[PDB]
């Protein structure tokens, strides 16, 4: 009868807000604006967010709350034929923890590297430097900046690895950092929601404090207005381009993370009659809103670099890890009270990651706990058994060629896997389970049915939206490359197994569960398309 519930409502919101808001809100969204026409970019971004983005986000939250179970069991009880979706999502989440947690390790490595009167990455005269070192970022590949060479030749030691075939030694300063991250994750997640629910109070909130003072510090710098100009100055010639819409579509989907099994897990500890429609609208908004603020943070400082430091905006305006571990720390080193801004920046970067790691792990734990009561009472031992597996294989990212391994998983593990998974999630919930059947479930919870708007999106828009992203993801596909290095064919094939191992669960479970039931062909489908609620 009983299932554990959130203590207080805020904990749930902070957990969702936390999982949702991460480094991609910082090192991706602002860049996309800059590249896509600035203020103009908000139109396709907004529409995509409205039609495909929020509906999927809303959907999984409602499902999580209604069915009251983790990913595996919930999709089993919804469309038994499609129960495979549960396994696909849990595996993906499993693969992702292997790499993503290392970003937090880097944040902590820099944090620990940040207590000095003079930051190590400011000059070119150190031992890890090369004769080609520059004070700041340029447009030539052979000549890097001071901050770039610090990250590459010192922190990473990536220069000593000839590719993925050669990982080299193990940096045990990085191993230490990765352990500390998993230690924190353990002591956060081992007691369940009662703890993890209140830990996210700090980790979800802290970033906004630091965003606040970095925003002021940024806008009070010379040339900060020039940054904002590059960031938001509207160009609508981009709007006609399909590539922009794809960029908006893709960003919205991967920033919100709908159908990732995390939202499902969190909402499953919700009280049945809780209003999840408000929770979805507020939570989504806060995510995009956070990205918007962060753009100001970044580009104010990026403008100051182009003004006082004499670097071309093109060169310093970047996405991904490069932005936060090189470009931004570079500007910080120049301004007064540098040691202060560096310390809170890398701490923000860490707490930005932590929120999301909890969710990912939680999706896995909750999913398994429900399907296997065997591990449900043993949870304190289980996540230890989990994070241990994480840490062990995670050591591959702490080697000198560890980035090559990291970059491999980043492209393959969750990229095309979760898209097809969520695509079936949409088709399951709407075409199979039915919208009217679904809408009825929601009315029982929050008292009123979903508007015809939400019902249209879940049915026609969602699949086309997902399909739209998937198609252009395949169209523009290129073999895996990092910098001047080109991954071997056997490396790509390895990733495709990782990409395919999750997705294959969908048909596998269907075919298997189909042969394991009695009756006709059409008689078996009705058995596997009958919800668990209808059988009572």
């Amino acid at each position, epitope marked *: 009868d009983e299932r554990e519930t959130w203590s207080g409502k805020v904990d749930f919101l902070l957990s969702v807000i936390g999982f949702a808001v991460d480094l991609a809100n910082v090192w991706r969204f602002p860049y996309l604006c800059y590249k896509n026409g600035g203020g103009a970019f908000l139109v396709p971004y907004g529409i995509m967010l409205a039609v495909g983005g929020i509906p999927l986000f809303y959907m999984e939250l409602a499902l999580g709350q209604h069915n009251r179970k983790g990913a595996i069991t919930c999709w089993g009880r919804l469309v038994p034929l499609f129960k495979g979706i549960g396994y696909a999502v849990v595996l993906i989440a499993f693969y992702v923890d292997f790499y993503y947690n290392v970003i937090i390790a880097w944040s902590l490595r820099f944090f620990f590297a940040s207590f000095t009167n003079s930051l190590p990455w400011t000059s070119c005269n150190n031992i890890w430097n090369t004769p080609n070192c520059r004070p700041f970022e340029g447009h030539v590949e052979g000549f890097q900046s001071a901050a770039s060479e610090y990250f590459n030749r010192y922190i990473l030691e990536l220069n000593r690895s000839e590719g993925i075939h050669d990982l080299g030694a193990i940096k045990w300063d990085m191993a230490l950092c990765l352990l500390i991250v998993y230690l924190i994750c353990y002591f956060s997640l081992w007691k369940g929601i009662s703890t993890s629910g209140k830990v996210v109070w700090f980790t979800a909130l802290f970033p906004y404090a630091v965003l606040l003072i970095l925003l002021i510090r940024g806008l009070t710098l010379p040339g900060s207005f020039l940054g904002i100009q590059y960031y938001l100055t509207p160009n609508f010639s981009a709007i006609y381009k399909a590539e922009v819409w794809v960029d908006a579509a893709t960003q919205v989907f991967f920033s919100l993370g709908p159908g990732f099994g995390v939202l499902l897990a969190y909402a499953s500890y919700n009280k049945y009659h809780n209003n999840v429609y408000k929770d979805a609208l507020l939570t989504s908004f806060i995510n995009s809103a956070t990205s918007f603020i962060a753009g100001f943070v970044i580009f104010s400082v990026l403008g100051y670099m182009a003004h006082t430091l004499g670097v071309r905006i093109e060169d310093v305006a970047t996405e991904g890890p490069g932005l936060v571990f090189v470009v931004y720390p570079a500007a910080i080193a120049t301004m007064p009270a540098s040691t202060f801004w560096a310390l809170i920046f890398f701490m923000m970067l860490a707490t930005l990651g932590l929120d999301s790691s909890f969710g990912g792990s939680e999706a896995i734990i909750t999913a398994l706990s429900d399907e296997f009561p065997k591990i449900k009472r043993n949870r304190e031992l289980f996540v230890a058994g989990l994070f241990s597996l994480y840490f062990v294989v995670g050591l591959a990212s702490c080697t000198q060629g560890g980035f090559y391994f990291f970059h491999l998983l980043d492209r393959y593990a969750a990229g095309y896997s979760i898209l097809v998974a969520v695509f079936f999630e949409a088709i399951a919930v709407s075409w199979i389970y039915g919208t*009217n*059947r679904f*809408s*009825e479930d929601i*009315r*029982d919870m929050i*008292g*009123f*049915p979903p508007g015809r708007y939400w019902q249209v999106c879940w049915r026609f828009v969602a699949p086309i939206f997902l399909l739209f992203i998937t198609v252009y993801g395949l169209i523009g596909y290129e073999p895996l490359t990092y910098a001047d290095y080109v991954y071997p064919s056997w490396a790509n094939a390895l990733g495709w197994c990782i990409a395919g191992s999750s997705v294959v669960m969908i048909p596998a479970v269907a075919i298997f569960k189909l042969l394991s039931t009695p009756g006709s062909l059409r008689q078996r489908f009705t058995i596997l398309t009958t919800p668990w609620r209808d059988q009572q």
Partner: antibody
Amino acid sequence: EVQLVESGGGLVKPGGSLKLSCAASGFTFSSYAMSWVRQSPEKRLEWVAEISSGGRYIYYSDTVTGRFTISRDNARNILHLEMSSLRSEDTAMYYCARGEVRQRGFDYWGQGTTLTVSS
Amino acid sequence: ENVLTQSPAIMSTSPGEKVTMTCRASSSVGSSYLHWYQQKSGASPKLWIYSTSNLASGVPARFSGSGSGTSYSLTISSVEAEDAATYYCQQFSGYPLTFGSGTKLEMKR
């Protein structure tokens, strides 16, 4: 536009059984949860049972629970209340009332049909 | 079970006058779950106010409603003869669903 007509009902001896029906027209019956509300001859309103749009969620008042069964046919657009083990307290004007939204209440009512339980 | 009591039981009002009637619940009710019904004699009930401030279709502007928690009220600014009826408050907050005891409105003469 939308109309609701309660039918069946009349005199029944205590302990007996009777099936009340409601003919829905003028809207999409399938998309709306219905409810039976009765009014005693002392003119007191009492909610009886609610059935979902697809009838997959049923709620009863503790007074009729286990005796009354609420039911739907979305093909013929008819609401049913089948009663058993009728007591005298069951005597009332039985109303067929629509609403799908708890926040808006019951926006439409039938003319009502009268049930008398006496020996 | 959440019982809604209404007072007055009966009230007489001279046309043009202002009438206020109250509905109080044993347990708190969400302000958006409280509704009012007007039932004219020999007729079936009609939805009047829902969410406690919101008039239904055809309901003249002379009608208003307010309240929160366990306390709500229906007010008529300037009463008319076509306003004479019994008024029922209803709680949709939780099951079982309950109706108020009702307030019968009559005209002074």
